[PDB]
């Protein structure tokens, strides 16, 4: 996250941190995710596409720091990894960039509710906030495009949803953005999501509930004028989510 504030997981208790195990001993961060129900975390297919070996990933809930432990955290193995058939990447965009991870602890259980572990709500079919709505994004991604390391402390920021007409202007992203995506930016192009924030949540209050409106997917640069962050439009994937979460 470029800009934003440092925060703790109590402020984003549905945030899930996904890591990958390496032969040699290191575990590295992959992407963020969101807890939708006790056993399911939703993220982005591009986070796994290149290495779809579920056994090598670790999911943690209740984590405020990247490589140190947080009291209350829960560790899970990925029982199922569901990628979107029809996911496609082009020169910038990722299409149908949504994935589901079914989690299981070493004791055979799913997540348990706590002050640091909570689920986020799903929107109703094709229902979105209107542009102009402020939503929050959270993640362990870069703090500056030139950094080569991720922050140790979780960050969060606020961005506003913008219209498809504005995002699809030739000097923004043109037709690269589809109706299955959402764009959000800071009015002053000061804060934004960046590499490392992929898979994480775009949360907005919708009909009184804090709702998972988008999944951080792509963007050209980070906090660049006329280059908003693009997110997978969750409201348009409800049938797909239901199909695998029944």
């Amino acid at each position: 996250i470029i800009g934003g504030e440092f925060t703790t997981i109590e402020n984003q208790p549905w945030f899930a941190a996904i890591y990958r195990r390496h032969r040699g001993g290191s575990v590295t961060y992959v992407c963020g995710g969101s807890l939708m129900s006790p056993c399911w975390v939703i993220s982005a297919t591009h986070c796994f596409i290149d290495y779809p070996k579920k056994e090598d990933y670790i999911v943690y809930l209740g984590r405020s720091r990247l490589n140190s432990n947080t009291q209350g955290e829960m560790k899970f193995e990925v029982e199922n990894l569901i990628l979107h058939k029809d996911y496609s990447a082009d020169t910038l965009a990722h299409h149908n960039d949504i994935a589901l991870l079914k989690i299981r602890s070493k004791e055979g259980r799913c997540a348990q509710p706590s002050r640091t572990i909570q689920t986020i709500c799903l929107p109703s079919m094709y229902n979105d906030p209107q542009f102009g709505t402020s939503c929050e994004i959270t993640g362990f991604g870069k703090e500056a495009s030139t950094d080569y390391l991720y922050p140790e402390q979780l960050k969060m920021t606020v961005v506003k949803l913008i219209s498809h007409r504005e995002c699809q202007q030739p000097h923004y992203y043109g037709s690269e953005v589809t109706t299955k995506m959402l764009c959000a930016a800071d009015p002053q192009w000061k804060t934004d999501a960046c590499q490392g924030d992929s898979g994480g949540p775009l949360v907005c209050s919708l009909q009184g509930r804090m709702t998972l409106t988008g999944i951080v997917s792509w963007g050209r640069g980070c906090a660049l004028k006329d280059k908003p962050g693009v997110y997978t439009r969750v409201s348009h994937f409800l049938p797909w989510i239901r199909s695998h979460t029944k």
């Binding site: 208790p13 689920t119 804090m210």
Partner: peptide, 9 residues
């Protein structure tokens, strides 16, 4: 207690 989506405590 149990999950209540969207609630921070």
């Amino acid at each position: 207690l149990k999950f209540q989506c969207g609630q921070k405590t």
